[PDB]
Amino acid sequence: ASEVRIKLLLECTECKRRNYATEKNKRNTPNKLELRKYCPWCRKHTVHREVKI
Amino acid sequence: PLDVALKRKYYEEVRPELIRRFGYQNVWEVPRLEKVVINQGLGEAKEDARILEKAAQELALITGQKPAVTRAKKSISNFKLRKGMPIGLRVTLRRDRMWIFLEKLLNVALPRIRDFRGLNPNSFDGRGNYNLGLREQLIFPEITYDMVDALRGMDIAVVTTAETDEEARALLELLGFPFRK
Amino acid sequence: MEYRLKAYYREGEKPSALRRAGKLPGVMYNRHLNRKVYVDLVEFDKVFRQASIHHVIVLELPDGQSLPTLVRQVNLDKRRRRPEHVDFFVLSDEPVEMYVPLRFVEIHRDILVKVSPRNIPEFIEVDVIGDSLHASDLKLPPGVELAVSPEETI
Amino acid sequence: ARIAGVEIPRNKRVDVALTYIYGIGKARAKEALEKTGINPATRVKDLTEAEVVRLREYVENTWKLEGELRAEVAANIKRLMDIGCYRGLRHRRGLPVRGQRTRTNARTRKGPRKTVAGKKKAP
Amino acid sequence: MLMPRRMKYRKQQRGRLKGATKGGDYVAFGDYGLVALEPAWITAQQIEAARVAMVRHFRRGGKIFIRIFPDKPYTKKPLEVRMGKGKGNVEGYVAVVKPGRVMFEVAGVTEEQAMEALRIAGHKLPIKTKIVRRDAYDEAQ
Amino acid sequence: RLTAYERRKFRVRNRIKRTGRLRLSVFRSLKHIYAQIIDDEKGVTLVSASSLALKLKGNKTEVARQVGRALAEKALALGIKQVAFDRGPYKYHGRVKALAEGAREGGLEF
Amino acid sequence: MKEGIHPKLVPARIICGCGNVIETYSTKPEIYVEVCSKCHPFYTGQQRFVDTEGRVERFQRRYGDSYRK
RNA sequence: UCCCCCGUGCCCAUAGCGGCGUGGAACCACCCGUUCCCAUUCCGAACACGGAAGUGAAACGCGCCAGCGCCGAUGGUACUGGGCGGGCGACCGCCUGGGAGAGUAGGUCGGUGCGGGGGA
RNA sequence: CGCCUCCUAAAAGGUAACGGAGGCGCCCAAAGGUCCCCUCAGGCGGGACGGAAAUCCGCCGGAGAGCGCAAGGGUAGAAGG
RNA sequence: CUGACUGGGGCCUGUAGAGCACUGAUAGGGCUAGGGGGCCCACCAGCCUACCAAACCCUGUCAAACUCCGAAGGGUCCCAG
Ligand SMILES: [Mg+2]
Ligand SMILES: [Mg+2]
Ligand SMILES: [Mg+2]
Ligand SMILES: [Mg+2]
Ligand SMILES: [Mg+2]
Ligand SMILES: [Mg+2]
Ligand SMILES: [Mg+2]
Ligand SMILES: [Mg+2]
Ligand SMILES: [Mg+2]
Ligand SMILES: [Mg+2]
Ligand SMILES: [Mg+2]
Ligand SMILES: [Mg+2]
Ligand SMILES: [Mg+2]
Ligand SMILES: [Mg+2]
Ligand SMILES: [Mg+2]
Ligand SMILES: [Mg+2]
Ligand SMILES: [Mg+2]
Ligand SMILES: [Mg+2]
Ligand SMILES: [Mg+2]
Ligand SMILES: [Mg+2]
Ligand SMILES: [Mg+2]
Ligand SMILES: [Mg+2]
Ligand SMILES: [Mg+2]
Ligand SMILES: [Mg+2]
Ligand SMILES: [Mg+2]
Ligand SMILES: [Mg+2]
Ligand SMILES: [Mg+2]
Ligand SMILES: [Mg+2]
Ligand SMILES: [Mg+2]
Ligand SMILES: [Mg+2]
Ligand SMILES: [Mg+2]
Ligand SMILES: [Mg+2]
Ligand SMILES: [Mg+2]
Ligand SMILES: [Mg+2]
Ligand SMILES: [Mg+2]
Ligand SMILES: [Mg+2]
Ligand SMILES: [Mg+2]
Ligand SMILES: [Mg+2]
Ligand SMILES: [Mg+2]
Ligand SMILES: [Mg+2]
Ligand SMILES: [Mg+2]
Ligand SMILES: [Mg+2]
Ligand SMILES: [Mg+2]
Ligand SMILES: [Mg+2]
Ligand SMILES: [Mg+2]
Ligand SMILES: [Mg+2]
Ligand SMILES: [Mg+2]
Ligand SMILES: [Mg+2]
Ligand SMILES: [Mg+2]
Ligand SMILES: [Mg+2]
Ligand SMILES: [Mg+2]
Ligand SMILES: [Mg+2]
Ligand SMILES: [Mg+2]
Ligand SMILES: [Mg+2]
Ligand SMILES: [Mg+2]
Ligand SMILES: [Mg+2]
Ligand SMILES: [Mg+2]
Ligand SMILES: [Mg+2]
Ligand SMILES: [Mg+2]
Ligand SMILES: [Mg+2]
Ligand SMILES: [Mg+2]
Ligand SMILES: [Mg+2]
Ligand SMILES: [Mg+2]
Ligand SMILES: [Mg+2]
Ligand SMILES: [Mg+2]
Ligand SMILES: [Mg+2]
Ligand SMILES: [Mg+2]
Ligand SMILES: [Mg+2]
Ligand SMILES: [Mg+2]
Ligand SMILES: [Mg+2]
Ligand SMILES: [Mg+2]
Ligand SMILES: [Mg+2]
Ligand SMILES: [Mg+2]
Ligand SMILES: [Mg+2]
Ligand SMILES: [Mg+2]
Ligand SMILES: [Mg+2]
Ligand SMILES: [Mg+2]
Ligand SMILES: [Mg+2]
Ligand SMILES: [Mg+2]
Ligand SMILES: [Mg+2]
Ligand SMILES: [Mg+2]
Ligand SMILES: [Mg+2]
Ligand SMILES: [Mg+2]
Ligand SMILES: [Mg+2]
Ligand SMILES: [Mg+2]
Ligand SMILES: [Mg+2]
Ligand SMILES: [Mg+2]
Ligand SMILES: [Mg+2]
Ligand SMILES: [Mg+2]
Ligand SMILES: [Mg+2]
Ligand SMILES: [Mg+2]
Ligand SMILES: [Mg+2]
Ligand SMILES: [Zn+2]
Ligand SMILES: [Zn+2]
């Protein structure tokens, strides 16, 4: 981790629950991360969006 | 395939003269042209522009074949060169497109070189291939001074199956390569 | 050339017992035989100082055989500077490699030669600081072949 | 690349255009045209392709031009330098050749000034 | 004085000193040699002293071969310090030398010139020595 | 010194043999196509087929599918059902693919 | 050959200044040139141009022997 | 059962480099083409497809050669488990069991399983 | 002053000193997954600008290149592109 | 009855010793890219080195953090006392 390499949560875009923790380099990757990930609540894969940790 | 004067000349004129000049026992022993590789090592277009386009568009007119970019293997400070910068165009001419370009290279291009006094006999590979260098791209008939923007030259590699320089020089002179000495 | 040396067969005597008994453990071999031998140390000394791996030594084994050998190896005890084993190469007609001396009419004292045991010369003569020539320009009497690359300076 | 190996500039009259060839001054431009029936006033842009080759053929065959002229000029300088005649030493060290004094100007032949320090006064 | 031009590591752990010399036990170049009878760390200064002694006896003549090289860094702490605080600084170089090693050879000289020169040299050495002459045992190696 | 051909052939064969299955190895010449199902633990070919043995001719692809069915036909006879396909140096395409499609059509499991 | 990335080679007529014609293929249907290989002074055998000299300088500086014999 | 070829393993250079000789009926390759499938940061070179006029030139297969590479004894030595001595030391020696590396002689231009095509 | 790599370390593991030398407190949205393909460094000869070194061609080349950064191990029958 | 220790058998190891194939060090000689040295040249060459200068070749060596090698032993498992 660092000031430019920030921790972040991934929020299921369909039930709004944060499901994963990870990082990115926000200078190299300014856009919000969007990744398909399995949501335990929706018991199915879903688009997940970065939010502030 | 199709009929190009140089190709038909290679079989009709140059192959029998080669056999009676060297005594080839097998018909595949006699030297053949393999490919023509054209190299514009630009480096002017390192970052100063993507002039590679206007120079590949003209390579595409001269050879009928779209060039491919070459990128810097290593980084070199003195060259102002980061690894991976697009620093040239290379195109591999084979078969009929090789003949058509070689045919025009001899018939119109080399004569259009000013102060031309013949190709260097010493530039043979040591192993039967030949290389020459041109300083202008408008030596070729498809390029006109109005269509140009900056003079760029090239390296031309002609590869043959001849094992020796001696065989290869006979192959290229018989086809019509004016050698200076 | 040439010399003669008594040589006796050994089997299970310790080399330390033989050395302590003033004798020199040794072996005899070629393509066809391999025998453990021993020579008397002082006798070997006076022959080898003259014969010295260039010249033929005929071994007189007690069983009547007079086998012609070339010394091919001498391991020394590095503390005492005394030989402690000898390899006698039994010469037979097949071509061998050996070192032949060089006498000049000065890097290399001798030279490696591929030769038949019949044609084993005593000399290889040279010619006339700092200058030097190479083994390429060399005499080569009948039967002998320069057993190196002639890139050798002499 | 038309005649000889140089493209003589269009939009100008043909007599001045031919001067842009190393080896042809105004007087030689007067010749080639008259000896070939091309109006010296014709703009290069407005010449027949028949007139191109008629102008070109004479020009390139009558006198030696661009590269060969330079090679023969170079050969004579080289010759003067090789034998060691006084003109040959001039072309070597880069000083004038035709009697001009060098204490002052000669700058065309010497190049930019190389200012050095001078002798001094007494205070 | 001799010493390595470059080195991977500045400081070596101290040797052991067992066993007859590993190699260099036969005269290789000259006619006469000087042989070590005991082991020792021979310093570069000892070598340079044995060498000059043989030059001033050969009055610039003959050939001198030095077949030991001081490559082992030798470390000493500054005077009066206490133990610890890391290894002392390198103050010199030694050549490990074990019984049987030919340290020096000479040639281009008479037998009397070489025997005396080698005798003087051995007096510069912190060990007992022995003068040898090139034998056939040597040339067979 | 290996060529790209040999490097490729090792590359795909190494991965197949790790799975432990019987290997349906395919060799394709300019004229003929050959198949043999192989036990690498015993080093024994269990069953084979080819245009050369079946003396077939015509469309190389259409013939390739045929040896596939022919190899499968004899394979099911000896109990062999599961198998791993070994395209060796070949792209999974054309003649090799047709032979592969043929073997499945005849009942081999891969 | 890849589709849509190359210029189409077509039969092509090349015209030189010596009335020469060449039948080759190219990207331009008809090209005119000022010089070909059938008339380049190097190609056309010896064709010594303006310079048959060599040189004759200098020992051919005769005219004359008018110092008295 | 034996010979040749093709495919696929195993030993992991005694199997390699180089030099030479040799093979096209079959098999393999190159080859003939680039319509079709598919393919080139450009190129039918590669990958791929459709073919069968030619050539074993390249590649590959099989042989012969020890120049290089690779393998490599026997004998002797170093060292050493255990047992004993010696020297102020640095270090050395004996008994018993074990025993290299280098080098010498020498060997090697592969050997073998399974399947398929062909042959006698 | 915690962590990593090598040595010391006496051919299992472990092993000390204010013993001999270095490194870490990050990074990567691909520098991650999988499928398909490709094979380096360097030597020599050849080639406009072009050099020791840019890009191109031939030959040789088992890995001495590369694998983000220390070191060691590993590795082209890929972990490298 | 499984223990210490011991017999046999398999596997693991990188020390002693040795070696120089890799990483470095290194003595003598030969052949040698960059020169100094320099009768000297710059008109464009050169040319000669009883001197330093990679690579290679021959002779000769050194290494805890070098290894193409490599013991005695040591460890561990099985069977037996
Ligand atoms: Mg990330
Ligand atoms: Mg839950
Ligand atoms: Mg955030
Ligand atoms: Mg013929
Ligand atoms: Mg075309
Ligand atoms: Mg040449
Ligand atoms: Mg043009
Ligand atoms: Mg060739
Ligand atoms: Mg007697
Ligand atoms: Mg004696
Ligand atoms: Mg010998
Ligand atoms: Mg003018
Ligand atoms: Mg004046
Ligand atoms: Mg200590
Ligand atoms: Mg040591
Ligand atoms: Mg001391
Ligand atoms: Mg100390
Ligand atoms: Mg100290
Ligand atoms: Mg300390
Ligand atoms: Mg020693
Ligand atoms: Mg003393
Ligand atoms: Mg004496
Ligand atoms: Mg002696
Ligand atoms: Mg030795
Ligand atoms: Mg059919
Ligand atoms: Mg088929
Ligand atoms: Mg396969
Ligand atoms: Mg007169
Ligand atoms: Mg039967
Ligand atoms: Mg096979
Ligand atoms: Mg087999
Ligand atoms: Mg040979
Ligand atoms: Mg033949
Ligand atoms: Mg062959
Ligand atoms: Mg055939
Ligand atoms: Mg036939
Ligand atoms: Mg199409
Ligand atoms: Mg062949
Ligand atoms: Mg051999
Ligand atoms: Mg071995
Ligand atoms: Mg050995
Ligand atoms: Mg033994
Ligand atoms: Mg001992
Ligand atoms: Mg013992
Ligand atoms: Mg011990
Ligand atoms: Mg014990
Ligand atoms: Mg003991
Ligand atoms: Mg005591
Ligand atoms: Mg003392
Ligand atoms: Mg002892
Ligand atoms: Mg002892
Ligand atoms: Mg013992
Ligand atoms: Mg014993
Ligand atoms: Mg051995
Ligand atoms: Mg022996
Ligand atoms: Mg031998
Ligand atoms: Mg041998
Ligand atoms: Mg043999
Ligand atoms: Mg062999
Ligand atoms: Mg055989
Ligand atoms: Mg086999
Ligand atoms: Mg088997
Ligand atoms: Mg069979
Ligand atoms: Mg049968
Ligand atoms: Mg059969
Ligand atoms: Mg603590
Ligand atoms: Mg910590
Ligand atoms: Mg340990
Ligand atoms: Mg360790
Ligand atoms: Mg443990
Ligand atoms: Mg304690
Ligand atoms: Mg620190
Ligand atoms: Mg992403
Ligand atoms: Mg990574
Ligand atoms: Mg990917
Ligand atoms: Mg070059
Ligand atoms: Mg370049
Ligand atoms: Mg790097
Ligand atoms: Mg770093
Ligand atoms: Mg590596
Ligand atoms: Mg019990
Ligand atoms: Mg137990
Ligand atoms: Mg035990
Ligand atoms: Mg040791
Ligand atoms: Mg070394
Ligand atoms: Mg050592
Ligand atoms: Mg060690
Ligand atoms: Mg071995
Ligand atoms: Mg231990
Ligand atoms: Mg045990
Ligand atoms: Mg055990
Ligand atoms: Mg028990
Ligand atoms: Zn959800
Ligand atoms: Zn013309």
Short mmCIF file of N, CA, C and O in Angstrom, two decimals, chain B residues 82-129:
data_model
loop_
_atom_site.label_atom_id
_atom_site.label_comp_id
_atom_site.label_asym_id
_atom_site.label_seq_id
_atom_site.Cartn_x
_atom_site.Cartn_y
_atom_site.Cartn_z
N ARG B 82 14.08 4.71 -25.75
CA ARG B 82 13.44 3.83 -24.79
C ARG B 82 13.09 2.50 -25.45
O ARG B 82 12.71 2.46 -26.62
N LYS B 83 13.23 1.42 -24.68
CA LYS B 83 12.88 0.09 -25.18
C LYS B 83 11.44 0.05 -25.65
O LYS B 83 10.52 0.39 -24.90
N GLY B 84 11.24 -0.35 -26.91
CA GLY B 84 9.91 -0.51 -27.46
C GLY B 84 9.43 0.63 -28.34
O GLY B 84 8.30 0.56 -28.84
N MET B 85 10.23 1.66 -28.55
CA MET B 85 9.80 2.75 -29.43
C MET B 85 9.74 2.26 -30.88
O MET B 85 10.59 1.48 -31.31
N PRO B 86 8.74 2.69 -31.64
CA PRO B 86 8.66 2.27 -33.05
C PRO B 86 9.72 2.97 -33.89
O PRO B 86 9.61 4.18 -34.14
N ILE B 87 10.73 2.23 -34.34
CA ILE B 87 11.91 2.84 -34.95
C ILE B 87 12.24 2.25 -36.32
O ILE B 87 13.41 2.19 -36.71
N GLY B 88 11.23 1.82 -37.07
CA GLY B 88 11.51 1.35 -38.41
C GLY B 88 10.35 0.58 -39.01
O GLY B 88 9.35 0.27 -38.36
N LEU B 89 10.52 0.28 -40.30
CA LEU B 89 9.58 -0.52 -41.07
C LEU B 89 10.35 -1.57 -41.85
O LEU B 89 11.36 -1.25 -42.49
N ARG B 90 9.88 -2.81 -41.80
CA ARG B 90 10.47 -3.91 -42.55
C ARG B 90 9.36 -4.67 -43.26
O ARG B 90 8.26 -4.83 -42.72
N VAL B 91 9.65 -5.12 -44.49
CA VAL B 91 8.69 -5.85 -45.31
C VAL B 91 9.42 -6.96 -46.05
O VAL B 91 10.46 -6.72 -46.67
N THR B 92 8.89 -8.18 -45.96
CA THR B 92 9.52 -9.35 -46.57
C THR B 92 8.82 -9.63 -47.90
O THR B 92 7.66 -10.06 -47.92
N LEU B 93 9.51 -9.38 -49.01
CA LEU B 93 8.97 -9.62 -50.34
C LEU B 93 9.41 -11.00 -50.82
O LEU B 93 10.61 -11.30 -50.86
N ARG B 94 8.45 -11.84 -51.21
CA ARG B 94 8.71 -13.18 -51.72
C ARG B 94 7.91 -13.41 -53.00
O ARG B 94 7.00 -12.65 -53.34
N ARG B 95 8.27 -14.48 -53.72
CA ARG B 95 7.52 -14.99 -54.89
C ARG B 95 7.32 -13.87 -55.91
O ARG B 95 8.28 -13.16 -56.22
N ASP B 96 6.11 -13.69 -56.44
CA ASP B 96 5.95 -12.78 -57.57
C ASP B 96 6.13 -11.33 -57.15
O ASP B 96 6.75 -10.55 -57.88
N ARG B 97 5.63 -10.96 -55.97
CA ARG B 97 5.88 -9.61 -55.49
C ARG B 97 7.37 -9.33 -55.33
O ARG B 97 7.81 -8.18 -55.47
N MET B 98 8.17 -10.37 -55.07
CA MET B 98 9.61 -10.19 -55.06
C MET B 98 10.14 -9.92 -56.46
O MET B 98 10.99 -9.04 -56.65
N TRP B 99 9.65 -10.65 -57.46
CA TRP B 99 10.12 -10.44 -58.83
C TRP B 99 9.74 -9.06 -59.34
O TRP B 99 10.57 -8.35 -59.91
N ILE B 100 8.48 -8.67 -59.14
CA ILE B 100 8.01 -7.39 -59.67
C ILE B 100 8.84 -6.24 -59.11
O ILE B 100 9.21 -5.30 -59.83
N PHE B 101 9.16 -6.30 -57.81
CA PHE B 101 9.97 -5.23 -57.23
C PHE B 101 11.41 -5.29 -57.72
O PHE B 101 12.02 -4.25 -58.00
N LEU B 102 11.99 -6.49 -57.80
CA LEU B 102 13.34 -6.59 -58.32
C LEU B 102 13.40 -6.15 -59.78
O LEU B 102 14.35 -5.48 -60.20
N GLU B 103 12.37 -6.49 -60.56
CA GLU B 103 12.34 -6.10 -61.96
C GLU B 103 12.35 -4.58 -62.12
O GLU B 103 13.10 -4.04 -62.94
N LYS B 104 11.54 -3.88 -61.33
CA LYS B 104 11.55 -2.42 -61.40
C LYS B 104 12.79 -1.83 -60.74
O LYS B 104 13.29 -0.79 -61.19
N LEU B 105 13.32 -2.48 -59.70
CA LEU B 105 14.53 -1.97 -59.06
C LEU B 105 15.69 -1.90 -60.05
O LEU B 105 16.48 -0.95 -60.02
N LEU B 106 15.79 -2.90 -60.93
CA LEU B 106 16.84 -2.88 -61.94
C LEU B 106 16.50 -1.96 -63.11
O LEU B 106 17.36 -1.22 -63.60
N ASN B 107 15.24 -1.99 -63.57
CA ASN B 107 14.89 -1.31 -64.81
C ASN B 107 14.74 0.20 -64.66
O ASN B 107 15.01 0.93 -65.62
N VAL B 108 14.30 0.69 -63.50
CA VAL B 108 14.04 2.12 -63.38
C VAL B 108 14.72 2.71 -62.15
O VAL B 108 15.19 3.85 -62.18
N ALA B 109 14.81 1.93 -61.07
CA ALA B 109 15.18 2.50 -59.78
C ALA B 109 16.68 2.78 -59.69
O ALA B 109 17.10 3.93 -59.50
N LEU B 110 17.50 1.74 -59.79
CA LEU B 110 18.95 1.94 -59.76
C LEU B 110 19.44 2.94 -60.79
O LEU B 110 20.27 3.79 -60.43
N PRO B 111 18.98 2.93 -62.06
CA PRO B 111 19.40 4.00 -62.98
C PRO B 111 19.03 5.39 -62.51
O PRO B 111 19.78 6.34 -62.78
N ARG B 112 17.91 5.54 -61.80
CA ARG B 112 17.51 6.85 -61.30
C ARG B 112 18.41 7.37 -60.18
O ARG B 112 18.33 8.56 -59.86
N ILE B 113 19.27 6.53 -59.59
CA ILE B 113 20.27 7.01 -58.66
C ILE B 113 21.24 7.93 -59.39
O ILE B 113 21.78 7.57 -60.44
N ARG B 114 21.45 9.13 -58.85
CA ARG B 114 22.37 10.06 -59.48
C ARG B 114 23.81 9.73 -59.10
O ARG B 114 24.09 9.30 -57.98
N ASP B 115 24.71 9.92 -60.07
CA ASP B 115 26.10 9.47 -59.98
C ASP B 115 26.18 7.96 -59.78
O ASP B 115 27.15 7.45 -59.21
N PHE B 116 25.17 7.23 -60.24
CA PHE B 116 25.21 5.78 -60.19
C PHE B 116 26.32 5.24 -61.08
O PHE B 116 26.39 5.57 -62.27
N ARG B 117 27.18 4.40 -60.50
CA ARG B 117 28.25 3.75 -61.24
C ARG B 117 28.29 2.26 -60.93
O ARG B 117 29.36 1.64 -60.98
N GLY B 118 27.16 1.67 -60.60
CA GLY B 118 27.10 0.24 -60.44
C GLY B 118 27.11 -0.20 -58.98
O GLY B 118 27.66 0.47 -58.10
N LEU B 119 26.50 -1.35 -58.73
CA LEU B 119 26.41 -1.91 -57.39
C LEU B 119 27.77 -2.42 -56.92
O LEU B 119 28.58 -2.92 -57.70
N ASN B 120 28.01 -2.29 -55.62
CA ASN B 120 29.29 -2.65 -55.03
C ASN B 120 29.50 -4.16 -55.09
O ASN B 120 28.74 -4.90 -54.46
N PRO B 121 30.52 -4.65 -55.79
CA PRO B 121 30.76 -6.10 -55.82
C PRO B 121 31.17 -6.67 -54.48
O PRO B 121 31.02 -7.88 -54.27
N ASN B 122 31.68 -5.85 -53.56
CA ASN B 122 32.20 -6.35 -52.30
C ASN B 122 31.12 -6.61 -51.27
O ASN B 122 31.41 -7.26 -50.25
N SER B 123 29.90 -6.15 -51.51
CA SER B 123 28.82 -6.20 -50.53
C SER B 123 28.12 -7.55 -50.45
O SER B 123 27.05 -7.64 -49.85
N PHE B 124 28.69 -8.59 -51.05
CA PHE B 124 28.08 -9.91 -50.94
C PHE B 124 28.29 -10.47 -49.55
O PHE B 124 29.28 -10.16 -48.87
N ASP B 125 27.36 -11.33 -49.14
CA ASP B 125 27.20 -11.76 -47.75
C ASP B 125 28.40 -12.52 -47.21
O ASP B 125 28.52 -12.67 -45.98
N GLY B 126 29.27 -13.02 -48.07
CA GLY B 126 30.14 -14.10 -47.69
C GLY B 126 29.51 -15.46 -47.81
O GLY B 126 30.23 -16.45 -47.95
N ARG B 127 28.17 -15.54 -47.78
CA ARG B 127 27.43 -16.80 -47.89
C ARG B 127 26.35 -16.73 -48.96
O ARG B 127 25.33 -17.42 -48.87
N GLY B 128 26.54 -15.88 -49.96
CA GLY B 128 25.69 -15.89 -51.12
C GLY B 128 24.48 -15.00 -51.07
O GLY B 128 23.60 -15.13 -51.92
N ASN B 129 24.39 -14.09 -50.10
CA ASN B 129 23.32 -13.12 -50.08
C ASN B 129 23.89 -11.73 -50.35
O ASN B 129 25.09 -11.50 -50.24
#
